[PDB]
Design a binder for this molecule. Structure first.
Ligand SMILES: O=C(Nc1cccnc1)c1cc(C(=O)c2c(F)cccc2Br)c[nH]1
Length: 160
């Protein structure tokens, strides 16, 4: 696991509902507005691993974290995302393929000691959608998650 996390960049992904996360866990894909797509695509080219750490708002927990497998691609079968009020699929950028590293949950109470230096040292659970997490802080956060024996780490390693 630590090899997968080496020198990774971590991003806090705040979904407004559980459905979108369930979709992401079932289909291994993710999407977002173009401006955020551009940052993720640029970060994928330049970083050894791009880890998304998911947290559904109000849930009090992280729902897991996944690693970008590639830049975003267009022209796929439409996914039934639950989008913010007033957003349509036409406003979305492409779709990202993601390999889940851990699908198990982590409550905020087990991360109360981890503070994000890149967000005024507030607890890592606190942050806006997209807030980047400092390397060591993000690494420790991922290591607090329960082990998930259902994930094939070699499938993700071969893509690095
Ligand atoms: O990707 C997201 N945010 C970010 C910001 C900045 C950089 N990287 C990433 C993000 C997507 C969401 C969504 O609910 C969402 C989704 F699940 C699927 C499709 C579109 C949408 Br909209 C929340 N947050």
């Amino acid at each position: 696991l630590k090899y997968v996390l080496q020198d990774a960049r971590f991003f806090l992904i705040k979904s407004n509902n559980h459905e979108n996360v369930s979709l992401a866990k079932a289909k291994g894909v993710w999407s977002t507005l173009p401006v955020n797509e551009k940052k993720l695509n640029l970060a994928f080219r330049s970083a050894r691993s791009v880890i998304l750490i998911f947290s559904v708002r109000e849930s009090g927990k992280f729902q897991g974290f996944a690693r970008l497998s590639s830049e975003s691609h267009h022209g796929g079968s439409p996914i039934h995302w639950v989008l913010p009020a007033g957003m349509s699929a036409k406003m979305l950028g492409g779709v990202f393929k993601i390999d889940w590293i851990c699908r198990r949950e982590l409550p905020f109470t087990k991360s109360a000691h981890l503070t994000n230096p890149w967000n005024e040292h507030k607890p890592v659970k606190i942050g806006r959608d997209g807030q980047e997490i400092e390397l060591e802080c993000g690494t420790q956060l991922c290591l607090l998650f329960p082990p998930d024996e259902s994930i094939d780490l070699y499938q993700v390693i071969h893509k690095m």
